[PDB]
Design a protein around this ligand. Sequence first.
Ligand SMILES: Nc1nc2cc3[nH]cnc3cc2c(=O)[nH]1
Ligand SMILES: Nc1nc2cc3[nH]cnc3cc2c(=O)[nH]1
Ligand SMILES: [Zn+2]
Ligand SMILES: [Zn+2]
Lengths: 367, 367
Amino acid sequence: RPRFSFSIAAREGKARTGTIEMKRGVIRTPAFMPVGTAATVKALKPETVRATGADIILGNTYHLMLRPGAERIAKLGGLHSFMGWDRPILTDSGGYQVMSLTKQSEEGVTFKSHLSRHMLSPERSIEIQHLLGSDIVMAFDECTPYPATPSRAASSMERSMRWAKRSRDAFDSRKEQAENAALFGIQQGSVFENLRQQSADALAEIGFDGYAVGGLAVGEGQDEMFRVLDFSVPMLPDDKPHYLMGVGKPDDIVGAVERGIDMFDCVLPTRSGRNGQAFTWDGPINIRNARFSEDLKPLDSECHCAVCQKWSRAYIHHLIRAGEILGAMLMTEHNIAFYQQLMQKIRDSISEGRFSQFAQDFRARYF
Amino acid sequence: RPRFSFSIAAREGKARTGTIEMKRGVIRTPAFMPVGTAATVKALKPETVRATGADIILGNTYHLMLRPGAERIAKLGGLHSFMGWDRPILTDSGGYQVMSLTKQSEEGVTFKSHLSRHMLSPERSIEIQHLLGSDIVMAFDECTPYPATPSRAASSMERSMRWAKRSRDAFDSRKEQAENAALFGIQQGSVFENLRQQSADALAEIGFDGYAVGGLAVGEGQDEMFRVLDFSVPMLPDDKPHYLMGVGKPDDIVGAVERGIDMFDCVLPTRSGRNGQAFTWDGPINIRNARFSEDLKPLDSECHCAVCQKWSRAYIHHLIRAGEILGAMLMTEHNIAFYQQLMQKIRDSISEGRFSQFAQDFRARYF
Ligand SMILES: Nc1nc2cc3[nH]cnc3cc2c(=O)[nH]1
Ligand SMILES: Nc1nc2cc3[nH]cnc3cc2c(=O)[nH]1
Ligand SMILES: [Zn+2]
Ligand SMILES: [Zn+2]
């Protein structure tokens, strides 16, 4: 098993399907990464997350450094052993969970524990990811508040590129980390093509194992996001994975893949699942609606997840309205399973050169 | 498979071990029944409940008649299909969940929806259990507030015996129910030996498939409960199961078995599990305590449950303090597994004629 090897097996338009081989496992792309912010994919045992088809999950530097603590997790043997997930884990750098969920400077960011004072710099971010034992380390960046003026978008992108270099050097100077994990850079620049180009060029000059498109999924509509992806993704190195941070709505994913994206993550499947929203091939439904109180059909008519094989909408409706934990468990497993099935259909259609048709058929029925 | 067959395979003192064969499965006694009040054993899939070793679970007439509704569950195919548990289910009659969680009369009880007006009589209680598709139906009784004066204990017991007859007749007059389910009577009489005797005699005269000892686990100390069991259990028919309602503390169960009890139920395993209390052979521990933050040992050193095979106290400690659903899931599976292991050790020791010794050894280490 190599430290990192991304191979593209098939293409159609800007879409690609392939694999990323890492020491802890293989990642099938396009891939969807369930979110496990507090060292757990909410309401699911790791074996269940794996059973749905997930090859990798997402962790968070910000949340884990606060609770239970980076040093503590290292003392306990690492995040993998801690939570019981032995496959790849990608960790965000914290560059967004601090300004989202605080004194900023060219050195990093200091903040008040939303739950104490804590400092987070490019060097400390990379070190925390090392202590967690992350497989895919994200460069520490400074996200840009949306909407953003050209001047502000430029300043934030420029700082992010300086921090990208500091992240690269911190990562490379740590032997154990450089030889066993991978480092992804993050493109910034808001919705401005020239800034995106400058960012892409700076990142490519430094060199990374993968390139994320940051600054999206922060309030912009799908039209705008797609517009930015149209010119932004082609700027990134073609032979490396393209990761769209925070994008998860089913239709968003299909459109992003049509534009060259290989990796995704979103709290939608889990967060919405707990809120009563279930994804189906015919569009999302809210199981709390009274019309489901005596509906004996499964969440989705085609889904092959364990939830749809055993329980009815009526039962889950009852569980969610009653505030039962099993309701959260079932809704979450189904939603994550749905997302993985979507990724599988995407991968197979690209491999067979019928992805454009799949996208059309998907949209027609989903909407 | 017979409708009902209780067989005693071995005995030691007042203790007995055996089986109850029913249409939906075999119940090993002494048995512990996990509680599934809202059509779910909180935080556990039915397959997980079964995996821990449970042969039967407990449902509630009161809660289910309010949400999702008895008629609704019947329309949906019954409680078994609804929640996905195909083995025996014992349902309490509601005679305690109304006066615990309201206009009373000789006809029954009317109450305000703690969540509307609803009536509950012996006839309606038996009918609801029928609509739910309960395997073991409990007679509708009137529990006695503890402490209780002799006069009040007598009145409540007398009414309960009149209601026991009405329950018997309602059950027998419903063909489908009489041929496929079983009916258990409930002994009352508070802590008064003469009332317990009168109740036992009235119940035996009517005739039931099993006899529960009611009126305990309502605030009395263990000494008092054991004292009442000492003279109460022997009053019940020897060849039928003896069910102690609501008793679950590990030491309470061991002592109750030493006194002739065959069945138990308690929310302790589940409720306490969610509260951070984990049962171990060395006594209960509260996983929220800071001393467990870096403890890599499993919840219990000997437990063979899936939780103890994969996760550390440190991780569960983190989950519970963070309010994570997986924390509730893991704590609950372990606690229910522990309770079943306890029942297995009890059953095996009785079969081998070394139960008295097991009880001594259990208490010595647990305390
Ligand atoms: N480090 C980092 N993380 C992110 C996470 C996001 N989630 C949704 N949009 C996101 C955007 C970013 C981003 O630009 N940088
Ligand atoms: N029907 C009925 N249910 C009960 C449930 C109980 N739980 C704890 N003590 C309990 C006592 C009773 C009782 O006496 N009758
Ligand atoms: Zn499903
Ligand atoms: Zn255990």
